[PDB]
């Protein structure tokens, strides 16, 4: 899957 | 701060 | 270069 | 925000 | 799991 | 080499 990163603090990597 | 990473999928980076 | 990430687990970041 | 990573060493993650 | 990152170029994140 | 990440914004990954 592709990994998409967000900064929300924490970093969240979510997948496709 | 340092980022500590975990995978559970979601990747989560938490700050120290 | 840009880093493109995938998860297969191993996370793999490839350079563009 | 979304996070974009670059490599040129050291990695840099920039927020969008 | 903990995620451990390596630069080998590519970035490889390996898990515990 | 191992990669360590820091956050202070922007993320920096430094090689060991």
mmCIF file with all atom_site columns, C-alpha atoms in Angstrom:
data_model
loop_
_atom_site.group_PDB
_atom_site.id
_atom_site.type_symbol
_atom_site.label_atom_id
_atom_site.label_alt_id
_atom_site.label_comp_id
_atom_site.label_asym_id
_atom_site.label_entity_id
_atom_site.label_seq_id
_atom_site.pdbx_PDB_ins_code
_atom_site.Cartn_x
_atom_site.Cartn_y
_atom_site.Cartn_z
_atom_site.occupancy
_atom_site.B_iso_or_equiv
_atom_site.pdbx_formal_charge
_atom_site.auth_seq_id
_atom_site.auth_comp_id
_atom_site.auth_asym_id
_atom_site.auth_atom_id
_atom_site.pdbx_PDB_model_num
ATOM 1  C CA . UNK A 1 1  ? 0.000  0.000  0.000  1.00 0.00 ? 1  UNK A CA 1
ATOM 2  C CA . UNK A 1 2  ? 0.919  3.652  -0.439 1.00 0.00 ? 2  UNK A CA 1
ATOM 3  C CA . UNK A 1 3  ? 1.680  5.387  2.850  1.00 0.00 ? 3  UNK A CA 1
ATOM 4  C CA . UNK A 1 4  ? 0.325  8.913  3.341  1.00 0.00 ? 4  UNK A CA 1
ATOM 5  C CA . UNK A 1 5  ? 1.664  11.056 6.241  1.00 0.00 ? 5  UNK A CA 1
ATOM 6  C CA . UNK A 1 6  ? -0.230 13.706 8.293  1.00 0.00 ? 6  UNK A CA 1
ATOM 7  C CA . UNK A 1 7  ? 0.824  15.894 11.176 1.00 0.00 ? 7  UNK A CA 1
ATOM 8  C CA . UNK A 1 8  ? -2.006 16.185 13.665 1.00 0.00 ? 8  UNK A CA 1
ATOM 9  C CA . UNK A 1 9  ? 1.069  16.749 18.074 1.00 0.00 ? 9  UNK A CA 1
ATOM 10 C CA . UNK A 1 10 ? 1.569  13.376 16.381 1.00 0.00 ? 10 UNK A CA 1
ATOM 11 C CA . UNK A 1 11 ? 2.439  12.077 12.967 1.00 0.00 ? 11 UNK A CA 1
ATOM 12 C CA . UNK A 1 12 ? -0.098 9.667  11.490 1.00 0.00 ? 12 UNK A CA 1
ATOM 13 C CA . UNK A 1 13 ? 0.730  7.532  8.490  1.00 0.00 ? 13 UNK A CA 1
ATOM 14 C CA . UNK A 1 14 ? -2.351 6.102  6.846  1.00 0.00 ? 14 UNK A CA 1
ATOM 15 C CA . UNK A 1 15 ? -2.431 3.551  4.056  1.00 0.00 ? 15 UNK A CA 1
ATOM 16 C CA . UNK A 1 16 ? -3.891 2.981  0.501  1.00 0.00 ? 16 UNK A CA 1
ATOM 17 C CA . UNK B 2 1  ? 11.447 16.777 20.234 1.00 0.00 ? 1  UNK B CA 1
ATOM 18 C CA . UNK B 2 2  ? 12.334 13.257 19.083 1.00 0.00 ? 2  UNK B CA 1
ATOM 19 C CA . UNK B 2 3  ? 9.741  11.279 17.124 1.00 0.00 ? 3  UNK B CA 1
ATOM 20 C CA . UNK B 2 4  ? 9.219  7.679  18.239 1.00 0.00 ? 4  UNK B CA 1
ATOM 21 C CA . UNK B 2 5  ? 7.385  5.515  15.681 1.00 0.00 ? 5  UNK B CA 1
ATOM 22 C CA . UNK B 2 6  ? 4.939  2.562  16.065 1.00 0.00 ? 6  UNK B CA 1
ATOM 23 C CA . UNK B 2 7  ? 2.932  0.604  13.522 1.00 0.00 ? 7  UNK B CA 1
ATOM 24 C CA . UNK B 2 8  ? -0.416 -0.958 14.363 1.00 0.00 ? 8  UNK B CA 1
ATOM 25 C CA . UNK B 2 9  ? -2.311 -0.356 9.566  1.00 0.00 ? 9  UNK B CA 1
ATOM 26 C CA . UNK B 2 10 ? -1.581 3.089  10.971 1.00 0.00 ? 10 UNK B CA 1
ATOM 27 C CA . UNK B 2 11 ? 1.872  4.429  11.556 1.00 0.00 ? 11 UNK B CA 1
ATOM 28 C CA . UNK B 2 12 ? 1.969  6.661  14.613 1.00 0.00 ? 12 UNK B CA 1
ATOM 29 C CA . UNK B 2 13 ? 4.848  8.976  15.418 1.00 0.00 ? 13 UNK B CA 1
ATOM 30 C CA . UNK B 2 14 ? 4.792  10.439 18.911 1.00 0.00 ? 14 UNK B CA 1
ATOM 31 C CA . UNK B 2 15 ? 6.901  13.263 20.193 1.00 0.00 ? 15 UNK B CA 1
ATOM 32 C CA . UNK B 2 16 ? 9.438  12.970 23.071 1.00 0.00 ? 16 UNK B CA 1
ATOM 33 C CA . UNK C 3 1  ? 14.682 14.192 -4.100 1.00 0.00 ? 1  UNK C CA 1
ATOM 34 C CA . UNK C 3 2  ? 11.156 13.480 -2.851 1.00 0.00 ? 2  UNK C CA 1
ATOM 35 C CA . UNK C 3 3  ? 10.563 10.349 -0.773 1.00 0.00 ? 3  UNK C CA 1
ATOM 36 C CA . UNK C 3 4  ? 7.538  8.262  -1.756 1.00 0.00 ? 4  UNK C CA 1
ATOM 37 C CA . UNK C 3 5  ? 6.456  5.750  0.912  1.00 0.00 ? 5  UNK C CA 1
ATOM 38 C CA . UNK C 3 6  ? 4.873  2.244  0.678  1.00 0.00 ? 6  UNK C CA 1
ATOM 39 C CA . UNK C 3 7  ? 4.052  -0.332 3.327  1.00 0.00 ? 7  UNK C CA 1
ATOM 40 C CA . UNK C 3 8  ? 4.106  -4.053 2.609  1.00 0.00 ? 8  UNK C CA 1
ATOM 41 C CA . UNK C 3 9  ? 5.581  -5.327 7.422  1.00 0.00 ? 9  UNK C CA 1
ATOM 42 C CA . UNK C 3 10 ? 8.322  -3.206 5.887  1.00 0.00 ? 10 UNK C CA 1
ATOM 43 C CA . UNK C 3 11 ? 7.993  0.463  5.186  1.00 0.00 ? 11 UNK C CA 1
ATOM 44 C CA . UNK C 3 12 ? 9.891  1.428  2.054  1.00 0.00 ? 12 UNK C CA 1
ATOM 45 C CA . UNK C 3 13 ? 10.685 5.002  1.112  1.00 0.00 ? 13 UNK C CA 1
ATOM 46 C CA . UNK C 3 14 ? 11.950 5.478  -2.426 1.00 0.00 ? 14 UNK C CA 1
ATOM 47 C CA . UNK C 3 15 ? 13.529 8.569  -3.846 1.00 0.00 ? 15 UNK C CA 1
ATOM 48 C CA . UNK C 3 16 ? 12.090 10.620 -6.765 1.00 0.00 ? 16 UNK C CA 1
ATOM 49 C CA . UNK D 4 1  ? -1.733 19.003 7.696  1.00 0.00 ? 1  UNK D CA 1
ATOM 50 C CA . UNK D 4 2  ? -0.311 16.530 5.117  1.00 0.00 ? 2  UNK D CA 1
ATOM 51 C CA . UNK D 4 3  ? 3.422  15.851 5.400  1.00 0.00 ? 3  UNK D CA 1
ATOM 52 C CA . UNK D 4 4  ? 5.809  15.653 2.439  1.00 0.00 ? 4  UNK D CA 1
ATOM 53 C CA . UNK D 4 5  ? 9.324  14.149 2.777  1.00 0.00 ? 5  UNK D CA 1
ATOM 54 C CA . UNK D 4 6  ? 12.504 14.959 0.826  1.00 0.00 ? 6  UNK D CA 1
ATOM 55 C CA . UNK D 4 7  ? 15.999 13.511 1.002  1.00 0.00 ? 7  UNK D CA 1
ATOM 56 C CA . UNK D 4 8  ? 19.182 15.241 0.043  1.00 0.00 ? 8  UNK D CA 1
ATOM 57 C CA . UNK D 4 9  ? 22.544 13.364 4.213  1.00 0.00 ? 9  UNK D CA 1
ATOM 58 C CA . UNK D 4 10 ? 19.231 14.256 5.938  1.00 0.00 ? 10 UNK D CA 1
ATOM 59 C CA . UNK D 4 11 ? 15.503 13.798 5.465  1.00 0.00 ? 11 UNK D CA 1
ATOM 60 C CA . UNK D 4 12 ? 13.174 16.790 5.702  1.00 0.00 ? 12 UNK D CA 1
ATOM 61 C CA . UNK D 4 13 ? 9.421  16.563 6.195  1.00 0.00 ? 13 UNK D CA 1
ATOM 62 C CA . UNK D 4 14 ? 7.505  19.727 5.267  1.00 0.00 ? 14 UNK D CA 1
ATOM 63 C CA . UNK D 4 15 ? 3.898  20.410 6.186  1.00 0.00 ? 15 UNK D CA 1
ATOM 64 C CA . UNK D 4 16 ? 1.135  21.212 3.747  1.00 0.00 ? 16 UNK D CA 1
ATOM 65 C CA . UNK E 5 1  ? 5.083  -2.776 16.920 1.00 0.00 ? 1  UNK E CA 1
ATOM 66 C CA . UNK E 5 2  ? 7.966  -0.332 17.217 1.00 0.00 ? 2  UNK E CA 1
ATOM 67 C CA . UNK E 5 3  ? 9.120  1.004  13.856 1.00 0.00 ? 3  UNK E CA 1
ATOM 68 C CA . UNK E 5 4  ? 12.871 1.319  13.276 1.00 0.00 ? 4  UNK E CA 1
ATOM 69 C CA . UNK E 5 5  ? 14.146 3.366  10.279 1.00 0.00 ? 5  UNK E CA 1
ATOM 70 C CA . UNK E 5 6  ? 17.315 2.761  8.178  1.00 0.00 ? 6  UNK E CA 1
ATOM 71 C CA . UNK E 5 7  ? 18.755 4.572  5.202  1.00 0.00 ? 7  UNK E CA 1
ATOM 72 C CA . UNK E 5 8  ? 20.209 2.075  2.764  1.00 0.00 ? 8  UNK E CA 1
ATOM 73 C CA . UNK E 5 9  ? 19.271 4.936  -1.724 1.00 0.00 ? 9  UNK E CA 1
ATOM 74 C CA . UNK E 5 10 ? 16.058 3.959  0.070  1.00 0.00 ? 10 UNK E CA 1
ATOM 75 C CA . UNK E 5 11 ? 14.580 4.285  3.507  1.00 0.00 ? 11 UNK E CA 1
ATOM 76 C CA . UNK E 5 12 ? 13.564 0.998  5.117  1.00 0.00 ? 12 UNK E CA 1
ATOM 77 C CA . UNK E 5 13 ? 11.346 0.903  8.169  1.00 0.00 ? 13 UNK E CA 1
ATOM 78 C CA . UNK E 5 14 ? 11.453 -2.436 9.924  1.00 0.00 ? 14 UNK E CA 1
ATOM 79 C CA . UNK E 5 15 ? 9.256  -3.535 12.799 1.00 0.00 ? 15 UNK E CA 1
ATOM 80 C CA . UNK E 5 16 ? 9.461  -4.976 16.401 1.00 0.00 ? 16 UNK E CA 1
ATOM 81 C CA . UNK F 6 1  ? 22.744 3.758  8.629  1.00 0.00 ? 1  UNK F CA 1
ATOM 82 C CA . UNK F 6 2  ? 19.952 4.035  11.259 1.00 0.00 ? 2  UNK F CA 1
ATOM 83 C CA . UNK F 6 3  ? 17.693 7.079  10.921 1.00 0.00 ? 3  UNK F CA 1
ATOM 84 C CA . UNK F 6 4  ? 16.527 9.234  13.836 1.00 0.00 ? 4  UNK F CA 1
ATOM 85 C CA . UNK F 6 5  ? 13.624 11.717 13.476 1.00 0.00 ? 5  UNK F CA 1
ATOM 86 C CA . UNK F 6 6  ? 12.992 14.993 15.331 1.00 0.00 ? 6  UNK F CA 1
ATOM 87 C CA . UNK F 6 7  ? 10.150 17.488 15.131 1.00 0.00 ? 7  UNK F CA 1
ATOM 88 C CA . UNK F 6 8  ? 10.322 21.138 15.964 1.00 0.00 ? 8  UNK F CA 1
ATOM 89 C CA . UNK F 6 9  ? 7.070  23.192 11.790 1.00 0.00 ? 9  UNK F CA 1
ATOM 90 C CA . UNK F 6 10 ? 9.293  20.552 10.106 1.00 0.00 ? 10 UNK F CA 1
ATOM 91 C CA . UNK F 6 11 ? 10.533 17.020 10.672 1.00 0.00 ? 11 UNK F CA 1
ATOM 92 C CA . UNK F 6 12 ? 14.239 16.235 10.384 1.00 0.00 ? 12 UNK F CA 1
ATOM 93 C CA . UNK F 6 13 ? 15.676 12.750 9.977  1.00 0.00 ? 13 UNK F CA 1
ATOM 94 C CA . UNK F 6 14 ? 19.379 12.451 10.838 1.00 0.00 ? 14 UNK F CA 1
ATOM 95 C CA . UNK F 6 15 ? 21.560 9.482  9.972  1.00 0.00 ? 15 UNK F CA 1
ATOM 96 C CA . UNK F 6 16 ? 23.547 7.436  12.440 1.00 0.00 ? 16 UNK F CA 1
#
